Amino acid sequence: NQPLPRLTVAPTYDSAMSNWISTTIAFFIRVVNSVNMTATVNDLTRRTM
Amino acid sequence: EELFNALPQPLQQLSLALAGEIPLTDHIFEQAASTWHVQPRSLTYKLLDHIPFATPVVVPPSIYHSLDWSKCFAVNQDRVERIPTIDNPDDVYVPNSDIGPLLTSLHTIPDYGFLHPTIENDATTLRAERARCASTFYKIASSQARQVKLDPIRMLGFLLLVQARPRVPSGLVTDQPTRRDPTLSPALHAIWQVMQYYKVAGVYYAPALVVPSGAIWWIPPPGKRNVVSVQYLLTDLISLAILAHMTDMSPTLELTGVLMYLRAASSHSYAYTLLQMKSVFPALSLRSMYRNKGFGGKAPAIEWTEPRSKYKFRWTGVTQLHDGLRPRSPSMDVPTLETLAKYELVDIGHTIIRERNAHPQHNHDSVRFVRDVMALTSGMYLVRQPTMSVLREYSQVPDIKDPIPPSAWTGPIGNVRYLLPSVQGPARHLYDTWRAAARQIAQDPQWHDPLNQAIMRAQYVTARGGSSASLKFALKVTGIVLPEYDDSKVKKSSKIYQAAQIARIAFMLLIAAIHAEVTMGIRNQVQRRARSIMPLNVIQQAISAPHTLVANYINKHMNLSTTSGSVVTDKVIPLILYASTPPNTVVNVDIKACDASITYNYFLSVICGAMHEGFEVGNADAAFMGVPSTIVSDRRSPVAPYSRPISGLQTMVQHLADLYAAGFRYSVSDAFSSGNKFSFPTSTFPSGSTATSTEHTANNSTMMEYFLNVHAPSHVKSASLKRILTDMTIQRNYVCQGDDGILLLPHEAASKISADDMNELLTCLRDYGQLFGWNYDIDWSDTAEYLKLYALMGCRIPNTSRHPPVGKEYAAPQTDEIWPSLIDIVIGHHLNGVTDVLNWREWLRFSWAFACYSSRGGYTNPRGQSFSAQYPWWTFVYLGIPPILLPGQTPFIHSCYMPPGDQGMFSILNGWRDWLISHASTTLPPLRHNHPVWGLSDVPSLLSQFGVYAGYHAAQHYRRPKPAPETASSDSINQITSDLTEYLFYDSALKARVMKGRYNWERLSSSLSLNVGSRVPSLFDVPGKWVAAGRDAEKPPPSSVEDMFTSLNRCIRRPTHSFSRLLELYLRVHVALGESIPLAIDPDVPQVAGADPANDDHWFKYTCLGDIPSATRNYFGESLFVGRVVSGLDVEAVDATLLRLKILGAPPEAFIAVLNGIGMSDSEAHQIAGRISLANAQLVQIARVVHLSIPSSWMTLNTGPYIHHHAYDFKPGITQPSAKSRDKSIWMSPILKLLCTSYAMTVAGPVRTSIVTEIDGSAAALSGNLRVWMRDV
Amino acid sequence: LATPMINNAIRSFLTAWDDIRILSPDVSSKSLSAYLDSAVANGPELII
Amino acid sequence: TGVMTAMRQVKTMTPFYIQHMCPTELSVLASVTVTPPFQVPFTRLVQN
Amino acid sequence: DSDALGDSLRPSFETQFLERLENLDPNLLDRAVASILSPTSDTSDDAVTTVLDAFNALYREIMTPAQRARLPLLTQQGRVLAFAHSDYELLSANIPIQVVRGSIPIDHVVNLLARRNRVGGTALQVLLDYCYRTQASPLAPTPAGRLYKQLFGPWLMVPRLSEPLIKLRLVASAPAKVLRAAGWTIDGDPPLEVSCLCAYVTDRAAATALIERRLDSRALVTVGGDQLMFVEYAPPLPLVSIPRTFLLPVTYVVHWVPPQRVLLNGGNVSFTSGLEWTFDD
Amino acid sequence: VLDPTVLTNAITTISESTTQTISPISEILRLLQPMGNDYAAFWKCIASWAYNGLVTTVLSEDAFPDSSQSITHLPSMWKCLFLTLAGPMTSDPHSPV
Amino acid sequence: VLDPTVLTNAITTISESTTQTISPISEILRLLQPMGNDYAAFWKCIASW
Amino acid sequence: VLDPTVLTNAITTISESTTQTISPISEILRLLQPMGNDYAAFWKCIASWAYNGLVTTVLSEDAFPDSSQSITHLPSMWKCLFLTLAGPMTSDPHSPVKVFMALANLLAQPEPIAIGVPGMHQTTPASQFSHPGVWPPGFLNPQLIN
């Protein structure tokens, strides 16, 4: 945690949440673009995921 | 035959059609239908005399020896007229006495007569012990004769018309001339032997003649009497004479049945004697088949799908039978022959057992013996007094062998008490299941959601028709202006008249004074023409709202009913077939009188204490559905009583405990007995209320769970059975719905269980319900019965007695209908003979006879004395009945699994199309212009000659009178509608959704520019849906009937000789059928009893497809893309709205305008619209946007894989490449594959691989033209 | 005419059922009761 | 390739069943049938 | 009275309860008196549960069908105050009557010991005390004094009221045609009326706003072949329906307003009629 | 006196007894089932100590869980739990084994 | 326990465009379900050894 | 203030050819939307952090992907995304081993590892790893996974 701000707030990506969220997506972009999904899932619908 | 010679010449001309000799043109259909109505009905029995025939049956003269009805009826407390039981305390039905002295002569027909009007006059004015006693008997005895659809006088007339000429042999080599003769039938002989008594000059007077107002009885001659049992005997024989020729019953098996009806007619109180033998014939055949030495055959190897909660089933081969697979259960022979000895019918027992032992193995012929004997049970709808229907069977209180002590309860918290943990019987597991299920609702944030609250208030209005208006009683504490709404013409039932007035007064100023004595039963007046019925007040259903919700949570994780129209044919039927297989033996647990077995003495005190402790979780300061938080008076601690704030969800339980303990006030106001009227409490729940009877399902799995795990693994004395009872689990071994359910034994020791161990199990199970008063109706016949449907070694046994050919339940003394509603009863009567499989040609021959009488109608108006209608022959073709013969081909090639509608009319106009082009290229001039689907051949003139277009529009035209007041006059229409609108739109948040929905759609109706004024299911259709669902039961005025009548003749005779713009587009597609698809099952295995190779059409369909519906990618749409709707909006009309806009390329705002129309949130309308897609959708659900659907006749089949990968949109070597649906095969192929199956199931014989051959235009031309159609809708 | 064509598919129905005859050929339950239930039923009488 | 690789990746008990459970099952049931198993040595791909 | 309905039968219900218990076991009765009167109660699955099922078999045999015959005495008169020993017979025999669950702040278990010379003695009074307690449905017993404030409460006003009140009554008028069907010697062309329910007002003008309008409830009057005569209402009338200035009695029986106009009763014929409050002089 | 309500109050609080919870709990709900002949199996097991050698109070056949069920099956280990406690109560000399 | 829901679901959940002349997804189900509806033939092989 | 239109509008505005049989846009919004609000369960998940001594919020067992479907089965994978995102929210001490195993279950054929004591295999359905002794050795030390 961090202490409470008193000015106008905006969604920032410095959080541990945003550290957790962005690195899962950075991990499942690797799983989707891995070799196992390449042999089965079609390449154009792999870009969609 | 000489029977055919005795028919009238226009009636002979239709028997030639029904035989298949000539095509049934419309002129034969008109003249013979006119021959039925102008004929005196007594002449039909003269035709039975024209057959000289003999069979060993003798009707005794002891039928006519009657009782005295006044010795059978008397007066008791509160001055009620009822039947004192003569012999046994259930003697309650119609006594067999002379109707003769009670009737006067009738003015129009002097041979018949209605009730003597001196008895009719005084019994409503002066309450006597004679006249009021007489009108009770007369209206009940007329009502039991009224329990038919139309007269059995005519139902025997259709059967003799079918049997006049034999059917012509079609070229399909699986047909046979039927083995049955009418000369050998003792059913027809007993009718002729009875009718020898009822002629005075060779004229054969019927004993009754059931006018649609009610039955009118024959006057007796001097010296002879007219007992009431004869008309009931004649109906049961005609019900048996029809079915036995449809089931191909042996003539030695009708005599088994006929001798029971003649015995019950010889005895007194015919319906009571027929009720005491209601379970003889299933006990002699179905309940006991294969207990002999030699046993074998083939049985389905159905496997339970191993994730147990999925309730999925797969047919996984055959199982050859042996003597370890025959039932270890004892036969039902010894308890049945003792019952037959009570009525001197022991030869009926020894006839079946001699014939049953001729079937030692399990074959097609053996299961036909089961359904033939089950056709011998009378399906006659027994009618007693509706006063006496409640005074005895809704009065039985249970016998609690282990009552809860008063020391086992805590101090009271307001009205309710909690159960102490010191008591740990089966009441504790009742108390602890309803408590934890109540905890998961105060946690659940599904409520305080405006759409979820709108669905529950829609659930009480739409589901049941309602009873009373107790707001006239509920003006006692709050001054209401009480609008009677005579300036709106609407019915004053509980559907509309209550809930519109609820929108003004809050619940909290009303729930404190809800307790009423005329809570339910009758429409706010103590004498009307309606029967005392089940549902109660909408604000006392609203105080019963959490009791529904906690019962829904118990049945959520166990009973995944999914709220679908196909749940019997998807879940019940394969469980019926997975049970009774030779691996597992079952105990079909039935709980009789479960509605009268849930009292406040045991059950409703425990659950209201469990819900109140269960609702203690969550916020104690929280309202619920308009009921605020309140002060309770706590008295648990003896030293510290105090005032606690409780939630609104606990506030409702405080009033529900006051309502359950006082009972349920049934008020009887039947129009059968002359003016008996009394309201009185009971502990009996309403029967048919599925939102309330789910509590019985909520206790059925719960109390079986304490039995199989705690009670019976400790109480039973068999050490071997404790090994079985250890690993039994209701998530694996028990399936319940309602009061009844199947108990399953574990697969290791299932069929190898000792019957002496099972008798010690069921003794403990029957003694287990003695702790609750639950009289378990346990059966141990090694057959399945889940919801009134049967099995035998994995073969479905269609109960032919369940759907009678003649019978129809009437809870009213009159039918309360205009004429053409009989036609909708015909189609339901036809498809019941298709689901319950019969001889499919002879049933189709019987149906066209039966439908021909339902083609002419005559209305009696004091203004206009003459009205006569005529539907064409092709009307019944559009509604579902397949034609027996087309001009230009061979008869009986059109299957009974043909769809109705345009989907069925496509199927006939495809195989018969090749004749239509050739026969119109000759004998007719060609077209001046060119036509797309027939070229230059003048086929639509020829179709206009046969009346194909005539019956097409006459079937699409409505057949129910619309009401007369509209909004164009000075009438005050929105008095009750806008107040019901305020009831549905309580929160301003949900009103802001729907106002946003119609504003965006009518903006996008003209900007997107595809439609104008088109019907889209918004929530303002729902008060239009509800209020119009109240005036449909109201009797229409003669101005509305004649306007409905004149619109029929204008619709028939109009020169619109074109089809709809879908069938005109369907006929471009030409499909063709290659070889038969390879097999689903081994046809030595009987799938459904009656589908032998003799009944050929049903035999191939259950063999080529199978009767286990394969859950596939499609699974015929158990998902409907909107999991919850306001009740009144059809989700069929919603998926056909969203998926059209997905095909049309609509902007996403067009989807959101539809979804805000049904009440979805703006957070929800985006989240559904992105979720729905054209590829993720299911192949049945795509075809529903063009009004193509799976019929009810296909529901018992496995149409899943056949529509998937046997029906071709494009078979690349055979078809022409004009039918390439490029870039449209995501949604055109569900239309093309389903039109392939629309014709495959219409052709008789085996199911062939269906191939689209060509489209007359391009497939792009058809994808363009349906896109034009989907813009118009 | 569809009436020979509906009488041609009955040939393809039976030869598919004659195909399933040769795959899983039926055998009498008098043998199946003998190879399963006659074992628990009868034997020689040794003790007398 | 997408269909065929999916069929490899199906989690099925029948490979586990064929060498763990049913050789125990077929052993026990061979002691209880009325005819003992008439057995001949199976051969992996040897000509003679 | 609650005890009187068990006294209605020609053998008394407590006399059969002697005969039912004596035929089975004298020893379990010797220890059911110690378990019911125990300070702390055990499961007692030998003593009391043999009494209660013998009680309920005795109860279901005679008492529930007799209560159905007692239906017109407990709800069909003008106004009644029925008493019951438990919540069961008002609901199990399906009689239309409002049940309130009473608890007075006197320990009733020592009153059964305080009373004497009963037909079963003081020992039988405490067994079937526990039998009716288990028979009663478990719900909060409201204080019975709150019921008696409705009944006997405003009858304590009239000694301190300085004004002698007047009498009102209901009218269910009967035609002579229904009262000459089965035979009644009745002198007069105006219709014969009956008093369904009386009420008392401390003046005349407070009823003038209510004597004019008829009451919206249908009242069918069962007249017996004997002197007895019973009244029922198609629409139950809420107690709250009468205005706040009515003094209606605790219980009230139906009688003809002229008794002398009725002669030669001769049979039982009922009739339906409306209601009008009127002045009785 | 033998009153299980001290145990029953202590054991019903920490128990759940819901339809997703019966399969572990159901062995000890049979313990809480109050149907008993004032606990005659206890006093008969004491009285067999005096008449040991003439009658021995062995553990029942249905006491023992079957020797094919694993310990992961939760009612089977309560069935072993109720046995180890009732072990030394018996006069069976083979009760420790 | 043999459950054809397992092997059919793994086949039908693979992505093929609906523009192709021959779809091998919908093709091998004609080699999978018909004539293989008797799955007890598996058990006749286990007993045959 | 929760407002699920944003993540809806973020996904439905990604481009996909509609000619495919399987839509990864549509088959995950099926697995995304509750019919009611059902968003206070997030706030019960927060409110349990003050009460982790009494109650531990467990990942819902009916939301795990089964041990029947592979990684090629598309809605089974997006469950494993939804488990991995909602991992640190739930206060169960065995949350990350259930997150780790629900993918290790879902690719047992391509990528096998060693799983703890015997009796708990890689195709154990990721809910029975609720004890600290059946954490796999590769999860404690990723060097043990090759």
CA distance B22 to B390: 54
Q: Which residues of F touch E42 (CB under 8 A)?
A: 1, 3
Contacts of B364 (CB under 8 A, 6+ apart): B1084, B1086, B1091, B1092, B1093
Q: How far is C34 from chain B (nearest CA, A)?
A: 9
Note whether B396 and B509 are same-domain residues: yes
Dihedral angle sign, alpha carbons of residues B1217, B1218, B1219, B1223:
positive
Residues of F whose CB is below 8 A from B705: 19, 22
Residue B1248, strand partner residues: B1076
| D14–chain H nearest CA distance, Å | 13
Q: Which candidate, B101, B195, B634, B178, places its Cα nearest to that of B415?
A: B634
Question: Cα B452 vs. chain centroid, distance in angstroms?
Answer: 28
Tell me, what DSSP letter sits at residue E178? T
Q: Give contacts of F 76-95 with B, CB under 8 A.
A: none
B1022 and B888, same structural domain? no
What amino acid occupies position B776? Y
Q: Is B369 exposed, middle or buried (0-12, 13-18, 19+ CB in 10 A)?
A: buried
Positive or negative: CA dihedral B783, B787, B790, B795? negative
Chain E window 4-63: which residues touch F at a Cβ cutoff of 8 Å? 42-43, 45
Place of tokens 């306007």: B1043
Nearest chain F Cα distance for residue E44, angstroms: 9
Q: Are residues B380 and B429 in the same domain?
A: no
**Amino acid type, B673:** S
> Which residue in B676, B518, B661 sits closest to E237, CA to CA?
B518
User: B505: domain range?
Assistant: 386-896
Which of B838, B867, B896 is a domain's end point? B896
CA distance B1018 to chain G (A): 34
Task: Tell me the two tokens of residue E1.
Answer: 């009275």
Smallest Cα–Cα separation from H5: which of B1152, B1263, A28, B1230?
Answer: B1152
Backbone φ and ψ for B1001, nearest 5 degrees, come out as -75, -45
For H22, name the nearest residue in chain G, comparing CA atoms only.
Answer: G15
Question: Which residues contact residue B174 at a Cβ distance below 8 angstroms, ignoring those fewer than 6 apart?
Answer: B1093, B1096, B1099, B1245, C10
Is residue D7 less than 8 Å (CB to CB) from chain C? no
The answer to whether the CB atoms of D6 and G6 lie below 8 A apart is no
Chains G and D contact (Cβ–Cβ under 8 Å for 3 or more pairs):
yes
Same-domain pairing of B339 and B280? yes
Residue that the structure tokens 């109960």 belong to: B799
Please check whether residue G13 touches H, CB under 8 A: yes
Structure tokens belonging to residue D41: 């040595």
Q: How was this structure determined?
A: cryo-EM
Last residue of a domain, one of B838, B865, B896: B896
- Chain B contact present for E39, CB below 8 A: no
C15: alpha, beta or left? (left if phi > 0; alpha if psi -120 to 50): alpha
Residue F18, phi then psi, degrees to nearest 5:
-120, 165
Residue B833 and residue B956 in one domain: no
What does the alpha-carbon distance between residue E254 and residue E80 come to, in Å, rounded to a whole number?
A: 11
* CA E29 from centroid of its chain's CA atoms: 33
Residue B116 and residue B154 in one domain: yes
Q: For F13-70, give the DSSP string.
A: HS----TTTHHHHHHHHHHH----SSSHHHHHHHHHHHTTTT---PPPTTTSPPTTS-
B469 and B491 housed in the same domain:
yes
The rounded distance, in Å, linking the Cα atoms of B906 and B200 is 54
Residue B270 and residue B315 share a domain: yes
Does B405 contact E at CB distance below 8 Å?
yes
**Residue B824, token pair as written in the block:** 């909708």
Question: Which residues of chain B does E229 touch, with a Cβ-Cβ cutoff of 8 Å?
Answer: none
Query: G46 vs chain C: nearest CA distance in angstroms?
Result: 15
B927 & B853 share domain: no
DSSP state of D19: I
Tell me which residue has tokens 């239930």.
Answer: C37
User: Phi/psi class of residue B1088: alpha, beta or left (left: φ > 0; alpha: ψ in -120 to 50)?
Assistant: beta
Q: Which residue of E has its CA nearest to B608?
A: E139
Overall size of chain E counted in residues: 281
Q: How many CB atoms lie within 10 A of CB B876?
A: 28
User: How far, in whole angstroms, is CA A42 from its chain's centroid?
Assistant: 22
Residues in chain D, total: 48
Measured CB to CB, residues of chain D less than 8 Å from chain A are: 1-2, 5-6
Residue showing tokens 């789910």? B694
Q: Tokens in use for H34?
A: 């509750």
The H or E element spanning position B1252 is strand B1248-1255
Question: Number of residue pairs across G and H with CB atoms under 8 Å?
Answer: 30
* CA distance from start to end of chain E: 32
Rounded to whole angstroms, the Cα distance separating B1079 from B273 reads: 47
From the CB coordinates, do chains E and H have 3 or more pairs under 8 Å? no
Ramachandran sector of residue B237 (left: φ over 0; alpha: ψ -120 to 50; beta: rest)? alpha
Total tally of structural domains belonging to chain B: 3
What residues of chain G lie within 8 A of the CB of D12, using their CB?
A: 6-7
3-class secondary-structure state, position B16: helix
End-to-end CA, chain B = 55
Beta carbons within 10 angstroms of residue E181's beta carbon: 18
Beta strands in B527-649 (DSSP E): 586-591, 630-634, 642-646
User: B596 to chain E: which residues are within 8 Å by CB?
Assistant: none
Distance from CA of B1060 to the nearest CA of H (A): 31
C48 touches chain G (CB under 8 A): no
Residues of A in contact with G15 (CB under 8 A): 41-42, 45
DSSP per-residue codes, B228-263: SHHHHHHHHHHHHHHHHHHTT--HHHHHHHHHHHHH
Best of H13, H15, H35, H45 to disrupt the B interface by mutation (most B CBs within 10 Å)? H35
> Touching check for H18 and chain A: CB below 8 Å?
no
Q: From B847, B873, B896, give the residue that closes a domain.
A: B896
CA distances from B1076 to B1220, B1244, C9, C23, G24 (A): 24, 12, 6, 19, 22
Q: What is the CATH number of the domain that holds B695?
A: 3.90.1850.10
Q: Which chains lie within 8 Å of chain C at 3 or more CB pairs, if any?
A: B, D, G
CB B464 within 8 A of CB B499: no
Residue of C nearest to G39 (CA): C24
For G49, the closest chain D residue by CA position comes to D39
Task: Enumerate the residues of chain B whose CB falls inside 8 A of the CB of residue E243.
Answer: none
Q: Please report, for chain G, how many H helices and E strands are present, in that order.
A: 3, 0
List the beta bridge partners of residue B743.
Answer: B587, B734
For an interface test with C, give the residue of B1075, B1084, B1241 to mutate (most C CBs within 10 A).
Answer: B1075
Residue B1073 phi, psi (nearest 5): -120, 120
Query: Which chains, if any, share at least 3 CB pairs under 8 A with chain F?
Result: B, E
Interface contact H16-A28, CB threshold 8 A: no
Q: Which residues pair with B735 in a beta bridge?
A: B742
Q: Does C47 touch chain B (CB under 8 A)?
A: no
d(CA B655, CA B653): 5
* Alpha carbon of G1: minimum distance to chain C alpha carbons (Å): 20
Q: Could you tell me which chain B residue has the CA closest to the CA of H20?
A: B1175
Q: CA–CA separation, B1 vs B51, rounded Å? A: 9
Write the DSSP assignment of B499-559 as a string of letters.
HHHHTTS-STTTGGG---SSSBSSSSSS--SS---S---HHHHSTTHHHHHHHHHHTTTT-
**For E254, how many CA atoms within 13 A lie in the half-sphere containing its CB?**
25
The answer to whether B1226 faces chain H, any CB pair under 8 Å, is yes
Q: Residue B1191 CA to chain centroid, in angstroms? A: 15
Nearest residue in chain B measured CA to CA from G30: B1205
How many Å apart are CA B190 and CA B255, to the nearest integer? 10
Contact B394, B521 (CB under 8 A): no
3-state secondary structure of B884: coil
Cβ neighbours of B446 in H, within 8 Å = 35-38
Touch between chain C and chain A: 3 or more Cβ pairs under 8 Å:
no
Taking CB atoms and an 8 Å cutoff, what residues of chain D touch C31? none
Touching subunits for chain A (3+ Cβ pairs under 8 A): D, G, H
CB neighbour list of residue H24: distance below 8 Å, 6 or more residues apart = A45, A48, A49, H16, H74
H73 chain-G contacts, CB cut-off 8 A: 9-10, 13
Q: Are residues B254 and B119 in the same domain?
A: yes
H115 touches H140 (CB < 8 A)? no
Which strand (E) or helix (H) includes residue B29? Answer: helix B26-38
Residue pair B599/B398 in contact (Cβ under 8 Å)? The answer is: yes
Does B406 lie in the same domain as B360?
no
Alpha-carbon gap: E106 to the closest alpha carbon of chain F (Å):
30
CA–CA separation, B434 and B424 (whole Å): 15
Q: For B719, which of F17, F20, F61 is closest by C-beta distance?
A: F61
Q: Can you say whether the dihedral through the CA atoms of B816, B817, B819, B821 is positive or negative? A: negative
Measured CA distances, F92 to A20, F50, F55, F63, F77 (Å): 63, 13, 9, 14, 22
Whether B1121 and B1138 have beta carbons less than 8 Å apart is answered as yes
G20 touches chain B (CB under 8 A): no
Taking the Cβ of residue B54 and every Cβ of chain E, the question of whether any pair is shorter than 8 Å is answered with no
Q: Which two tokens stand for residue B1170?
A: 């992105």
**What are the residues whose beta carbons fall under 8 Å from the beta carbon of B1241, sequence distance 6 or more?**
B895, B897, B898, B899, B907, B1101, B1194, B1247
Those chains having 3 or more beta-carbon pairs within 8 angstroms of chain D are: A, C, G, H
CA-CA distance, H115 to H145, in Å (whole number)? 11
Interface contact H119, partner D, CB < 8 A: no
CA B782/CA B780 separation, integer angstroms:
6
The SS3 assignment for B894 reads strand
Residue G41 sits at the chain H interface (C-beta within 8 Å) = no
Q: Which residue is associated with the tokens 């309560």? A: F78
Q: Are residues B464 and B327 in the same domain?
A: no
* Kind plus residue range of the DSSP H or E element containing H46: helix H40-47
Residue H61 phi/psi, 5-degree rounding, is -70, -30
Query: Across chain C, which distance is largest between two alpha carbons, in Å?
Result: 77
CA E183 to chain centre: 31
Q: Quote the DSSP letter at residue B418.
A: E
